[PDB]
Each structure stands twice: as structure tokens, then as C-alpha cells.
Design a protein around this nucleic acid. Structure first.
Ligand SMILES: Cc1cn([C@H]2C[C@H](O)[C@@H](COP(=O)(O)OP(=O)(O)OP(=O)(O)O)O2)c(=O)[nH]c1=O
Ligand SMILES: [Cl-]
Ligand SMILES: [Mg+2]
Length: 373
DNA sequence: AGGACCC
DNA sequence: TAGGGTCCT
């Protein structure tokens, strides 16, 4: 059975949130800085050659008038990220988050419901909303085309709601599985949407210039695949199944080979409430294990306010570190009476004991709360 | 714990 | 070269 999936992906999300706070940043090229990294920038800045994730130096050298704002505190972006998801959940309850500014929504049931409500004459006036990938011709007698055009109409409505209710612009992609939705959502940026009819699936997949660009294939699998002389999507498409299982295991092998064909049966899962709460900090160095205790107290402070607000309780805590010049973690359950909520001083002895069990009394420190209930 | 992947 | 997240072995 075919599906209609939508992938919603916001424009320069952190930048966009900062530009709604202080409008004085509109019309100015804008980057959001975290330590020595420009994590994202507005499209005014991408015109000037600034790119996502280039360090501050490279960015000021390329754009000396670039405005930098600090984005080390995710509180505002996180609040907005969930307003967006909750809005999308109004359309269909089953919404899958991916990072802070992407959502998958399975529009299938919605699409069929709207067609059940259309009169025959009304069914030939069905029009696309936005771009059709590869400028492909629509065949109104093709049931799949009709369903994907309705999918595109719902997408437009979503985007219109996010601008009208939260003042946010973004892109959307409508396709038949999650993978295709997310590959097509990027074809026209910013603030536009694109629909992929089936005939054009191979065109879209082959539009990629290397397997790294396929969601599901990262730095490890990519580098592994290169060692086998697989560099294009068609290489992976035509590569030998058996040989691929042996180097990657039947799992990674079969899933990514199907991906290379545009085929993706994975369902849109309901993300619901977060599975974990964490904060972290990086620095030049921290060999003051008494000072590390101060940093840990600061991290833990905010997390308490956040986890409290959620209304569920974590039954496990974790501490994470990174050694000089490759991360390590140590966890433990959370004492039952401690869950009953001065909870700091208790937690600080726990985390420090976890600290010392990991290090003998320094470039990162992180606290995670998981096992929520 | 760690590792892979994602944004 | 940041600050987050998911799920699997
Ligand atoms: C990929 C990535 C994103 N982010 C944050 C910054 C981004 O604003 C936000 C969403 O990431 P993206 O959707 O990848 O990028 P974007 O929305 O900023 O840019 P685009 O307009 O091209 O879609 O998440 C990081 O902090 N680190 C990362 O490595
Ligand atoms: Cl499968
Ligand atoms: Mg985005």
C-alpha cells in the first residue's frame, strides 16, 4: 500500500528564531555562533558565501560585516521546536521529529479522507501546490498523482499555519516514503515546497553526487563504502549484495542498498515527549576537578528546572566527559526518594562519585537525564 | 558503555 | 569543531 508522507524542514532555524526576537537583525547577514563555530546563518548571509558550520574566522574573512549572535543556550529554539511539532500534530497525531526543525507526518489517512469527500467533477480540478520535482507532467487519472497532489495541498496548509500561528517559514517535501520526502524537501530553498511523483524517483536519487548524501549513510559507512570503490548512488545500486553484507552485516547492507534505489518502508513513528534531557559544555581545558564540580553544578541546575517542568521523572542519570587531545560515560539509577521532586547537593555527590570513578583526581562535561516515567 | 546515525 | 537528539549492539 502506498503512502503520502510530508517532510517539513525550517529555514535556518536558529537564525530564524533570533531574527524573530530582535527584528533589527532582518536585512543583515546573520550567523548563530557556538564557541568558535557558526552553526547556521540566515539566507542573507548565505548569499555572501557564509556556509553552515564554518568557523568564525572563515566566516568573518568571507563576510567581515556578518552579525554573530550566541546560540549556546538552546532553550528558545527548543521551545519553538515543540510548538512546531504540536501544531503539526493537529493535522495528524503521528508526527516524527528529526532534530529540532524537521518533522515527518504520514498524510495518508488524511489524503484518502479528503478524496472520499470530493465530487467527480471536483476531482478533475485538483491542482498541485508549489513545485513538482523535475517539472514532471501530472496525470490527473493517475490515482497516485492525485493523492500526492492532495498531499501537497495539505503541506501548503501546514506551512501556512506555521507562518500564521508561529511566524516561521520552512520547506516541505511530499513523497511516497520518508526518504524521498526528505530528499525532495530540499530541492527548492528557502520557504518553498516540492512534490515527487513516482516517475521521477530515480531522477531524484541519481541527482545525488555521493552516497554520504543519503540519510542513513554517515561518516563511517561512507568511508567504508569508498574502500570498496563505491562512490556514486549507482555504484551502491549495482554493487553485489553478498559482498556488501560481509563488510557491513546483513543489516546495514540491505537497508542502505534499498535506500540507494529510493525504497524506504520505515514508518513515521510518533516522537511524543523527549526520551532524554541533557546539557553540556566544552572548553579549552578543565583539570580543576574542584572546578569541574562547579561546572557540573551549573549544568545540573538548569536541567532540574527543565525536567521538573516536563512533569515526568527520570530514573537514571549519566555523566559524560572528553579527554585531552573519544568520549566516556558513567551512569547509575536515581535514588527513589531523590526522585521526589534541595535535590542538588544529593545529585552532586552522585555525579562526582561518577566523575571520580571515570577520572583519577578535560575538554567537555555533560549531564544527561534519561529513563523518564 | 559504547557506537552509529540524525539535526 | 557546538549542543543537542534517536536507537542499536
Ligand atoms: C546539522 C546541525 C544543525 N544544528 C542546529 C542549527 C540549525 O539551525 C538547526 C537545524 O539544522 P538544519 O535543518 O540542518 O539547518 P538549518 O535549518 O539551520 O538550515 P537550512 O535552511 O539549510 O535547513 O539545528 C546544529 O546545532 N548542529 C548541527 O550539526
Ligand atoms: Cl525492509
Ligand atoms: Mg532546516
Amino acid at each position: 500500500s502506498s503512502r503520502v508522507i510530508v517532510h517539513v524542514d525550517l529555514d535556518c532555524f536558529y537564525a530564524q528564531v533570533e531574527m524573530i526576537s530582535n527584528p533589527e537583525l532582518k536585512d543583515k547577514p546573520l550567523g548563530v555562533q557556538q564557541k568558535y563555530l557558526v552553526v547556521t546563518c540566515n539566507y542573507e548571509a548565505r548569499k555572501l558565501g557564509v556556509k553552515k558550520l564554518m568557523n568564525v574566522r572563515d566566516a568573518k574573512e568571507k563576510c567581515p560585516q556578518l552579525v554573530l549572535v550566541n546560540g549556546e543556550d538552546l532553550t528558545r529554539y527548543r521551545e519553538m521546536s515543540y510548538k512546531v511539532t504540536e501544531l503539526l500534530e493537529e493535522f495528524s497525531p503521528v508526527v516524527e521529529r528529526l532534530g529540532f526543525d524537521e518533522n515527518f507526518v504520514d498524510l495518508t489517512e488524511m489524503v484518502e479522507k479528503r478524496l472520499q469527500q470530493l465530487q467527480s467533477d471536483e476531482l478533475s480540478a485538483v491542482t498541485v501546490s508549489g513545485h513538482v520535482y523535475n517539472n514532471q507532467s501530472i496525470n490527473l487519472l493517475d490515482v497516485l498523482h492525485i493523492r500526492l497532489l492532495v498531499g501537497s495541498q495539505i503541506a501548503a496548509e501546514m506551512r501556512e499555519a506555521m507562518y500564521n500561528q508561529l511566524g516561521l517559514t520552512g520547506c516541505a517535501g511530499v513523497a511516497s516514503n520518508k526518504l524521498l520526502a526528505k530528499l525532495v524537501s530540499g530541492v527548492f530553498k528557502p520557504n518553498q515546497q516540492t512534490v515527487l511523483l513516482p516517475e521521477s524517483c530515480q531522477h531524484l536519487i541519481h541527482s545525488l553526487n555521493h552516497i554520504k548524501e543519503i540519510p542513513g549513510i554517515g561518516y563511517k559507512t561512507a568511508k567504508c563504502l569508498e574502500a570498496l570503490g563505491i562512490n556514486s548512488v549507482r555504484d551502491l545500486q549495482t554493487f553485489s549484495p553478498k559482498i556488501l553484507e560481509k563488510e557491513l552485516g546483513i543489516s546495514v547492507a540491505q537497508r542502505i542498498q534499498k535506500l540507494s534505489f529510493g525504497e524506504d518502508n520505515s514508518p513515521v513513528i510518533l516522537s511524543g515527549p523527549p526520551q532524554s534531557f541533557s546539557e553540556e559544555d566544552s572548553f579549552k581545558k578543565c583539570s580543576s576537578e574542584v572546578e569541574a564540580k562547579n561546572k557540573i553544578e551549573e549544568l545540573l541546575a538548569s536541567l532540574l528546572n527543565r525536567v521538573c517542568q516536563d512533569g515526568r521523572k527520570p530514573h537514571t542519570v549519566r555523566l559524560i566527559i572528553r579527554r585531552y587531545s573519544g568520549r566516556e560515560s558513567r551512569q547509575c539509577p536515581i535514588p527513589s526518594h531523590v526522585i521526589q521532586k534541595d535535590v542538588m547537593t544529593p545529585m552532586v555527590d552522585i555525579l562526582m562519585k561518577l566523575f571520580r570513578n571515570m577520572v583519577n583526581v578535560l575538554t567537555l562535561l555533560s549531564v544527561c537525564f534519561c529513563n523518564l516515567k
